[PDB]
């Protein structure tokens, strides 16, 4: 059989770039969170909300490419 | 390149060279140092107690 | 002699092997299969350089005068103090073995890397005819076995100390509860620390090896490819720059060894 | 706790041991906990919060200065 | 067959690069937003407003590509 | 002709790079914008203007790549 | 067959890109953690709490990707 | 088979890479410009003059490569 | 057969990416460690403790990668 | 024929790589210049002199790479 | 035969990636070391000690990869 | 045919990578150089003296690869 | 001969990555060294000393690279 | 190629190497040697004053 393996490769491109962009994107954001915490510990629970709130936007596109990656991996065989 | 029994032949010369330097070079050449430091201390303790 | 440069650069890669199976010399054209074929050419320079180390050391250590040190003695106890200062900085414990080990590592490997500095066909052009040998690669370190021989000779010590100074107790603790600190995560911790420990020595051996293999390689290429009248206008920069490479790559060997062991115990 | 001194050119405004303080720095707001690593900055005019040891909070007003 | 298969690779590439682009841009912008927050906590709402007003731009071209990903996966398949 | 779905790849690449470039460039610019705003929270109008003034140039080139990608996908392939 | 050996290529790409992402993310986050701790050395444990939180978050997609990579390596 | 699809892909590489270059370069330069402006609200015009001068030296290799991608498409393809 | 030449390259790619990620992700962390040290050396032992404690985490995925690379390149060959 | 349809890919990649190099390199350089101007605007024209001294040096390689990219697209084909 | 065509690419990729990683990481570290030294000479030696501590962790995976590159290029190729 | 063209692809990659490296490195060094002037402008000549030594060291390995690209293009054709 | 054509690309990848790495690393390191020298210009020689002491570590894997690249391109080829 | 020519070409490089090293690499290290010699001598003289 011939057709299948090449599509699994296409899933690697989907999820490999999603891991990179998602991990390093938040990593930057996670840096400024901790730095802010160090300058004002008594705001650490306040800022914690603002970290997540923006983090939701960070992984928006990575989440799309995640959902499709497992679709192209599993569902489309 | 290719791994060879040389890996074990050299472990001998290594480990033994370490001992035939440790047991007869290192403490000696640190003795020649410490035995001079003990002297460098005395002149200073002299000068200070003599001022006193 | 029909020495095409593609083949001249090839021969220098060969080793003077002994087919201990036949107690024979393994010819370059056919390489016998076995693990029992000593690379004599580097191995012998191993003991040779360890001797030029130890004899010039004992020939003061057994003869040490604490007066105004001779202009010769000066350099030897200079390096002595340098080494001991570094060791005292990065190691604090009682074990006597660490400092002499570091000294031997440092100077022995410095010399083993040094012997690359002579023109690389000098001894291979002499030994072919004065002795009847097929090959002789001078730099002991440019073969993996010796570099990994020393890496494993320090891994031996790592195991010795890691079990001694903290027994089975702390050794097993760090090997079970790190990094993730939860008991359910012990399966996570195991493999990670496994090859973490196993990589540290191998990376040492290869850090020493590759630098010198590709050191020699640049000399082979220049010595073979370019016409006589210009090999200098490149061998000059490369050699004087490789001075720094040999120095740093031995000093780094010493530092990382000391750090591995001191970190294990304390 | 750590020892806090608020002194002007003329007189001593506060002293004694503290658990934390929050100051408005020239660059941004700040907050100093014990052991905080050495720092030097200007401060803007405005309040400063102290928690005297055992949580007794109080606000002092400062016209400026240097921390 | 291959006309069917390879267009999924050609979509996956767009989806991965859109992942990286959007994640990185929003991460950096959110990092500076958090850093402003920790230093000017009373202005948090104003900077929040400005953060949305500007994020709206970074997220535009990536969401061009994101929808084109579903197009080429399905609109042609 | 097995070439139809290959132009799709050229559009995919061109527009993925468009996404990356635009997202990252304007993310950096918006970060510095917010960092300026945090200092001069009264001057948000002036900076928020200049931000558009220059953002209009940052993404100029990627916009063209997006247009050409659509051209290739639809008006050619 | 050609069907088997390419999948190792796909898995290799998943593993490599997940390694890049996870390593760089944790490196940046740890660097800011270290300097933040050097600033307030008495709050180390609280900052380590809030560090582990986002360290978990950042390895979400890289651990998903490693999962699928090992899947393709052994689940087929 | 090896003509058109093989040209559009080269044009895509060219213009995509020029997009990345222009986007990120002008992003950095504009970020610094906004920083300076927020520091010095008096020097906006002098600073923006300097900005345009240097931006002229950022943009004028992307202009080359983008025009050349168009030449590939409209003068070969 | 051509299994083994491709198997070789797959390990080479995965482990090259592992090497880049680990090198840079540790370099950054060590750079911050050193600039934290130079401002007050007396904290060197504590911060070195923290440095190893953290770096053991960064070296999680690259170690997995090297393990699989050696397995493929030797066990599967 | 492939031998000369594909060259446009080589020229494409060569000067596409040179596009980001020259652009980003000067974007990095112009930035420090702009913030120097904003702090000590008294120095500007002398700063601008120093800028140019190397401004061309950054374009040492990208230009020759640009030329050799053209030569092929216009003299080899 | 066909093996020697691939083997050297399967090596060069490994070694080029290891080079990128090692050089970039070591530079990122060495910069923070140097500018720290220039603050406080006579802290130079302690910082150099710690720099040589940290450099040893950077060069681990790159050097494993270089060792395997030399394996492939001479134990196989 | 393939014989003669692949060397042009090789030269394209070989010199494009070198152009990227040289441009980025020289740009960063020059940026820090310029920020040196902006702070102690009477020190221009000394910083200039040092810059060119360091800048040549940045261009040391970038220019040998460019030369070998030239050789491949014109020696091997 | 087939070996030579495939090899003259395998070497190109190696030396291009070598150039990028060895340029960017030295650029970062030289930039920090320059700011150091500028801060305290009576220290230039000591700074150059430590600079070289670090430059060697940076350009080790990049030099290992160049050697094998040239070996391939002229010893096997 | 004729190996004789490569050997002579190598010897040229090696002499050009040594003649640089002997005015750039030997002086500084013997100056370190001499510095430490002098600095031992001074700590001897110090004790010889102290015994006054």
Numbering used by the authors:
A (entry chain S), E (entry chain N), F (entry chain O), H (entry chain P), I (entry chain M), J (entry chain I), ...: 3 to 79
B (entry chain X), N (entry chain Y): 1 to 52
C (entry chain a): 4 to 269
D (entry chain H): 3 to 69
G (entry chain R): 3 to 78
Direct quotes from the study:
Here we have used cryo-Electron Microscopy (cryo-EM) on detergent-solubilized cysteine free E. coli ATP synthase13 to probe its structure and understand its rotational dynamics and coupling.
Focused classification of rotational State 1 highlighted five sub-classes, here termed Sub-states 1A, 1B, 1C, 1D, and 1E; with resolutions of 3.1, 3.3, 3.1, 3.2, and 3.3 Å, respectively. The defining theme of these sub-states was flexing of the central and peripheral stalks, with the majority of the flexibility seen in the peripheral stalk which bends and twists, together with minor movements within the central stalk. Independently, the movements seen between Sub-states 1B-E do not facilitate rotation of the c10 ring and instead illustrate torsional flexing of the entire complex. Sub-state 1A was in one rotational sub-state (here termed Sub-state 1’), whereas Sub-states 1B-E were rotated by a single c subunit relative to Sub-state 1’ (here termed Sub-state 1”).
